Symmetry: C6
Subunit: 102 residues, 6 copies
């Protein structure tokens, strides 16, 4: 499901922010020789799924229609204390209130 | 919204400290050819809004129109045991008293 | 057996991402002059096992059938806020309820 | 209030240890063209104030009159488990007992 | 007894992977001139004792009489979420239930 | 409290391992023109106190009679889970039980 260099073998490091992830997302796409429309929805589906579950959760959180920028800001912070500062608090409240998960 | 290398793109990384983000910001603002008043407010609107939810929200935390010193000290602590530490024990207290959020 | 430079000796770094470790494994694997199928069943048997208990455990966790992509998506979650948030989330309440372990 | 390269613009990176930040301060101070006395008092009034709220709170904590060595010893520990750990332990207990803050 | 570089000094960077440390042990062991066997038992007695108190601890948990491989399977989990996660949960529940220690 | 480059000015980075620090110090000590004996009297008191509050305290923690074997063997874990697993496992029991400190 994606050969080396192909935008399909492109993924946001588990810790890689969206801002860092995104840059290369398209650099490796440019490596892929696909029409814009071919790469377009790829630019979309490959980006988000391969965008590190912290971001995917955010991206999905931003609700569809999100802009590469909107997701970018929310999932950009993914990586440094910018986002993590908050996630430690929420992850913490993810267990305190939501400890029971079914 | 925001072209590459523009002060608009300029986004304090999450971990990106204010003194750091702020340093490349203005170096970058210098790079975008804008009028004085244009850079004058970009220096503002792009510095606080795209200032990494930690620093950014800090500026807003300090209170709007915050003196560069107020956002600087407050955000110049972003990335160190000075501020980062505050986030570890404090967010921890956001879930202690403020865990119930609606 | 499984001395250095062998896909056997190929163990995802403790923190080496499935995206990297897979590359390492697949880089040291190619370096390993094994039959194609041999590499493939190593890719199947060695990978899952010598893949960093975080990814490794996941591999088994996704349940058999995990395409290289499934173990990839699941083991790609591992390494940052995406998954770490969760590991922290469970290791925390596993201790709370599941503290009693026999 | 403080131009670039001036000791006024000199600020201990949040994580920047005092040992590193002191060098950058004085190295930069050398760069700043201020009388020996003017540099000497910057060395005092600037070094402390722009010394990373962590080392900065340590300087005051050591108590005014702290010899550069005193702030150095205490503010040198800033940046690693040396100080960061102590902070984790103190901040940790600052929320346990001191959580109520007015 | 045991000066720098001599395997005796050979120690796992506490965060250093067992695999790397071990490589350092063995890479440097080769550097420490001994009888074939002498280097080997060092490989045993020194490695466990000087391999990151966590791995040092794992090894004992790996079963006195641990093979270099077994500990390799476990200590490899060190330096990674494999262990960072596990330690977090255990230290977490040990203090909670086992808080009273005598 | 020690001139630059002198073994007196030799200080284990707050994160600097004792292994690295012990090595920095001894090289620096050789650089430090302390008599053959003075270096030995330096290698003793300086090495213990300037070696990063984490080790430094450990050195005292090992209790008097701590030979390089004790401080190196303890302060070795400094930097990662070896020494630190204790910092995180015990801190948990240092604040929970010992939070009240007078
Ligand atoms: O110990 P690791 O699992 O390898 O985590 C490290 C560790 O961070 P923590 O303070 O959270 O433990 C580093 O700090 P030190 O071990 O050197 O103290 C830190 O880097 P800084 O020193 O610059 O704060 C770095 O975080 P990062 O590089 O993201 O800023 C992070 O590594 P990972 O999160 O990538 O595992």
């Amino acid at each position: 499901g994606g050969s080396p260099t192909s935008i399909l073998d492109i993924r946001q490091g588990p810790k890689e922010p969206f801002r860092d992830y995104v840059d290369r997302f398209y650099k490796t796409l440019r490596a892929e020789q696909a029409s814009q429309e071919v790469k377009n929805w790829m630019t979309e589906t490959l980006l988000v799924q391969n965008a590190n579950p912290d971001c995917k959760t955010i991206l999905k959180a931003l609700g569809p229609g999100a802009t590469l920028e909107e997701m970018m800001t929310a999932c950009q912070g993914v990586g440094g204390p910018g986002h993590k500062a908050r996630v430690l608090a929420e992850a913490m409240s993810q267990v305190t209130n939501t400890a029971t998960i079914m």
